[PDB]
Amino acid sequence: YDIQAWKKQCEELLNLIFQCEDSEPFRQPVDLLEYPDYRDIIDTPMDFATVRETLEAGNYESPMELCKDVRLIFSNSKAYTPSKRSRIYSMSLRLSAFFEEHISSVLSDYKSALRFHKR
Numbered sequence: 082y083d084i085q086a087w088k089k090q091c092e093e094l095l096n097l098i099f100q101c102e103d104s105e106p107f108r109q110p111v112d113l114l115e116y117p118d119y120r121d122i123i124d125t126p127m128d129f130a131t132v133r134e135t136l137e138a139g140n141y142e143s144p145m146e147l148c149k150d151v152r153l154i155f156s157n158s159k160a161y162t163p164s165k166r167s168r169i170y171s172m173s174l175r176l177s178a179f180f181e182e183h184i185s186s187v188l189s190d191y192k193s194a195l196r197f198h199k200r
């Protein structure tokens with residue numbers, strides 16, 4: 082029933098994501114010099130360094146807000162791909178499966194703890 086435990090759990094999950102070779106395209110903001118019409122297609126850029134900085138600054142209140150920003154990394158990649166068979170989009174689908182597998186217990190434990198706090 083620890084209401085604060087999600088934050089270190091998310092720190093540890095982000096460390097595992099940075100070690101994954103599949104995170105390479107997503108570790109820093111998309112480079113506009115490489116992809117000059119990126120902002121014609123994507124309204125809200127997001128990347129894993131921005132998620133980690135937001136967590137370490139104390140600017141997430143819950144693991145649901147961190148999960149919304151990580152899901153936006155993967156939705157942006159789907160929207161910007163020219164094909165469902167592309168290399169950067171194929172790395173985004175494997176990394177999304179790994180993330181969803183690990184975030185599920187973090188969300189459940191936090192939501193259970195808040196329900197106990199409010200009982």
Ligand SMILES: Cc1noc(N)c1C
Nearest residue numbers: 111158161162169170
């Ligand atoms: C850049 C970039 N971001 O996502 C994809 N799918 C590409 C290409």
